[PDB]
Design a protein around this ligand. Structure first.
Ligand SMILES: O=C(O)c1ccc2ccccc2c1O
Ligand SMILES: O=C(O)c1ccc2ccccc2c1O
Ligand SMILES: O=C(O)c1ccc2ccccc2c1O
Ligand SMILES: O=C(O)c1ccc2ccccc2c1O
Lengths: 364, 364, 364, 364
């Protein structure tokens, strides 16, 4: 119970003879790697990611996406003017964590990003901006400040900026899980979008965004949410109500002065997509969350307010639009200077689906 | 495949001798009933309910509930001034069908109906009225025109009329299933209601009526919906959108010019309660639904508009607030003279949970 | 919390005037029954069945089934020489409890009981006998001492006695639930059986009775078990192992000296059929089970040994093949004089599927 | 639909100026990697693993494990004398595929491999040998020819060879998925095993290996199977019965002359463990399976017989104990010269749980 790989006796250390050396040479030849030279690495005491905790500043992400907007045309080959946050610990891979791409995308005036689909699951989130529609399976979906937009695996999507002003948002994808696991399919669709109309709300939303109500034409459950946009007005209202209910002495908040919602698939009550969990948190000025260790990785974008994240004991101060990653099992807490709003995503549905999830909370 | 109990050969007709008669006498003595005198009754070719299709007029229900309001005080023993629709086929039992109580309840000015709970699941529906709050687990829930209010099994509830004007609504309960199956528990609570406050919306609603959004404090699934009120404004809007989407050539409606929603438990996407399914239908003027045979029983209350129900070939004309029951397997269709809005409930969740459900639709 | 319908104040007792009497007369005319004259009956404090606890002796059931075998031919109309245990509390209905038919069936030498199917779910259990095959969907299934044979709803089945000696067994069916709920469908099949072959084991068994192993051709889950026979040798061995494990200090038994298995659907690990739960219990000589109150009804047939049942405080002594019923919520315990083996069935899957189940155990 | 990353127009190729070069330099500085230089790699048209199909010969694995048995002591540090098959395509990692460790382990006379546990899920399979017991949570489990032994995540286990003769078997683990995903926990237990007793069968088996029967003390579902050993005699019998049923014209086999079982968790009917699927196939002499493309990776060990595997068009001949891996989406078929028995495992439960699974079969 108390020993680690540092502290235990290495009892499988063979005599370094010419025959041993011949046996090891013969291993390499035959595509064999013995367990005993390697045990501690393959099976650590607790998760020890190669991904490192890290913070990206929004002013930095903005300046670089804007410069990218001058110098690089968006179109067919590369598909998107999207800049992926790359974990310094992940050997040059465009992965914010071992499971997830997190990135900034920029669409300049009147630009179109052509239609494609991929098994990989995706979502858009907007800290600031208006002007872009993303057309998901032919259904135009407005993008605005505070909106979560979904694009589940295997759905066609392309984006067009219907205005003379640029917008930026963030993408989250299971791109990295999907590459390492070999699950990727990809298909090119129309070079434009298939509908340039700009309805204020999409068809999915007009069918599925009535609370506690389900169309009779939609009685089959789905693996991904059929809600295309989760609009800021509902998220804001939910969070306010939880805070109001707290004031009124009623249970609601997840911890004192900590309001939070999880975005869900209305057909099951579960996660928006099989691999990706989205949440939105609002902390009262002064709130400090209890330190957590969680299996798998999570990313936050600050939506509004000022505060700090503490990861491994290290406080970093945070401003609007800043992003950070918390690798598997790294202890973390948030601290609200003002009322602190944040957008969150994680690979938790993968961890929970496979029974790998664990949670340590300080104070219990 | 073609034979019925009329047409088949009775090959188990014993010789009527004194010994046979002695054997049958000996059966009665020993609490034995032979199968062979009775097979066709116990196992019909298709469902053949003792419940009969029937229509109750709202003007009749109103007049009688109003007279009940003059002559009978509401309070402790009988619990509610509630008049239960009794199927003429069900031998004097207060059952609209073998599974369900359907009834009108009337609360006069400033009256209180004291708090109780029961394993039996319940809901309220309001064709017309305002003024009553029903307090569910201490949480006051406004009742208004078009609102579905829930009261799942084992939750405390009592009603108070906060106005100088009477209101009527309808109750649905699994009272009859529950009596015949022996599942009933009952408990007396406070003689008043435990909160006389009249918020415009309840705590459940302020936590759970944000579309696609789930509090993090409510991540456990429930057997019954935690939404206390499903308010007319959302039901009306959903139904309008489905009709609009139909006009725009988009899939949405359940059949042409037939819009419909099912009321659901947001934690699972399934039925409001284990035994009871609620739905709301809006038909375009002129729409006639395809004839259906369904296992189990269903009740509709006309909410708005004029039309007809056909049950067993028999058309009955329907007006606002009228109720009807369709027993198991009785063929039925609705016909809309004007735009025809109806509230619906059924025992279908019982049938589906136990794999007894079947559905015959004319044209397929 | 402490008041019952005896103890509470009747506050809805209207003044007995000619107008009140006219209002009540007008109720009967309009198929209306008021709640207030009836509340305590519809909603008892705890379940209060019309079914009564009762014991049927096997010597009595045997003598009557044997006499039935002389006087009544088995064949087409009545379908089966089956004698149903009728609860004295259930008004002349052939119901052992509100949900379940329990009955003895007798097939004389070389008799055939023709093929039929019905939505109603069924099983056979054999305390003593050999000689009968029951052909389920064309698949001959041997019947022997200690065997549970299944016949889920909508499967064809007919029985033939391949010997010059009579056999008796018991049937359990959701016949009574199904009649009162209107779920019954019925269909006549072949007048003989469709296969007279007498394999020692059936096709279902040769595919599905290998522990922890599932054919790749059978990867879809089923609502009912595809195992046609649960043979005594496995049931006996399981129960022995649990007793052995208990001796060895290992967890296994359900309570001290109480071994028990539940018969299951290998495709889900759940109940054999949607409405019916089957179990088999073996108690050590001297064991007395803790008193239980359970929602819904249960029937036991003594398989081997001597003991007693206590129901409502009343001990009745039990011998091999005797049957008893325990109505919903009646307190019950078993007492083993010798090693006491019993077969059990219940409507518990109905109660649990609809969240009506409750359980009170003395000592917790 | 027809274009790939070779064939499409690269429209995001910026002008190679000093400012562009400065922008790219500034990306590296800020831990940013643009999508457009990389799109085709991250999102291939269909899965394109770095893992390569490959075959390891059993005579080679045996000779090297035997030599390892002379030169390397087994004990505390390295934990196991286990040789992991390393995919030539996976950059020096001890991974047979991106998700799975597949390896040979050798325990010499009277050796003990000390107790540990790890979140990572494991199983043992034995083509040949007897003499070893693996003690899982204190419960000794015999290992013999043809046996699948389970060791789900977080269960203590250590192995001891109770004989004067060496045994080898194979291990499968989600070691590689678990390393890349950061889910690993590890704990050292006793230096010996906690029980040296050698029962012919384990406690798990004596409780859970009765077909269609479930202890009442084990009514909670488990995430992993509680069956510790799936013994060759049941696997052999199942496969024989399927072949017999085929001869008798009865459905059973998965394809003509192709018999197959999946090893399952009896509590759910699903996979043995969350990440790992085990199966066993028996092909008639002459059988050739239809070419399949499946998402995720699979490993087979030949158990008995002679035949061939075809992967990417390439036939390799196979003998007893040989192993091969089929990476995600590589087309594969087996060809039986004699009756061909094989053991199989895969990451399919991961793929299916996350909705990534796809299947192409030649002829449909
Ligand atoms: O469609 C989009 O907006 C989008 C954005 C970012 C992406 C990053 C990696 C892989 C695919 C992406 C993708 O398809
Ligand atoms: O609480 C209520 O409003 C109510 C209304 C009608 C009822 C009819 C039968 C049994 C219980 C009822 C009940 O509890
Ligand atoms: O098929 C059988 O053996 C059988 C036995 C008893 C039955 C009692 C009531 C209704 C149907 C039955 C039935 O179909
Ligand atoms: O316990 C065992 O037998 C065993 C065998 C092989 C293993 C390969 C990689 C990681 C852990 C292993 C492990 O725990």
């Amino acid at each position: 119970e108390k020993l680690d790989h540092e502290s235990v006796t290495q009892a499988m250390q063979p005599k370094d003879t010419p025959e041993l050396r011949a046996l090891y040479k013969s291993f390499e030849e035959e595509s064999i790697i013995p367990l005993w030279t390697q045990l501690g690495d393959l099976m650590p005491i607790h998760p020890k990611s190669k991904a490192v905790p890290h913070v990206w500043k929004w002013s930095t992400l903005l300046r670089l996406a804007r410069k990218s907007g001058e110098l690089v045309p968006v179109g067919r080959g590369g598909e998107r003017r999207a800049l992926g946050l790359a974990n310094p610990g992940l050997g040059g891979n465009a992965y914010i964590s071992p499971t997830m791409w997190a990135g900034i995308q920029y669409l300049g005036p009147r630009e179109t990003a052509p239609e494609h689909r991929h098994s990989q699951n995706a979502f858009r989130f907007v800290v600031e901006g208006e002007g872009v529609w993303t057309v998901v399976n032919g259904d135009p979906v407005r993008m605005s400040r505070g909106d979560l937009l979904l694009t589940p695996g295997w759905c066609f999507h392309g984006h067009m900026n219907d205005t003379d002003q640029p917008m930026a948002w963030i993408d989250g994808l299971d791109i990295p899980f999907s590459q390492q696991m070999d699950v990727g399919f990809f298909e090119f669709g129309s070079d434009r979008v298939t509908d340039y109309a700009t309805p204020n709300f999409s068809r999915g939303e007009r069918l599925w965004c009535h609370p506690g109500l389900r169309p009779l034409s939609g009685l089959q459950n789905t693996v991904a949410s059929p809600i295309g946009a989760y609009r800021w007005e509902f998220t804001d209202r939910a969070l306010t109500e939880q805070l109001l209910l707290e004031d009124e002495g009623q249970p609601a908040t997840v911890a004192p002065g900590h309001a939070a919602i999880r975005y869900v698939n209305p057909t099951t009550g579960g996660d928006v997509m099989p691999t990706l969990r989205c949440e939105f948190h609002r902390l009262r000025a002064g709130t400090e969350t209890a330190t957590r260790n969680e299996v798998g990785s999570t990313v936050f974008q600050v939506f509004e307010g000022a505060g700090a994240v503490v990861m491994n004991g290290e406080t970093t101060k945070l401003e609007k639009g800043d992003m950070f990653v918390v690798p598997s099992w790294v202890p973390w807490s948030l601290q609200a200077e003002t009322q602190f709003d944040l957008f969150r995503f994680s690979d938790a549905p993968i961890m929970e689906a496979l029974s790998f999830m664990r949670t340590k909370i300080e104070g219990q």
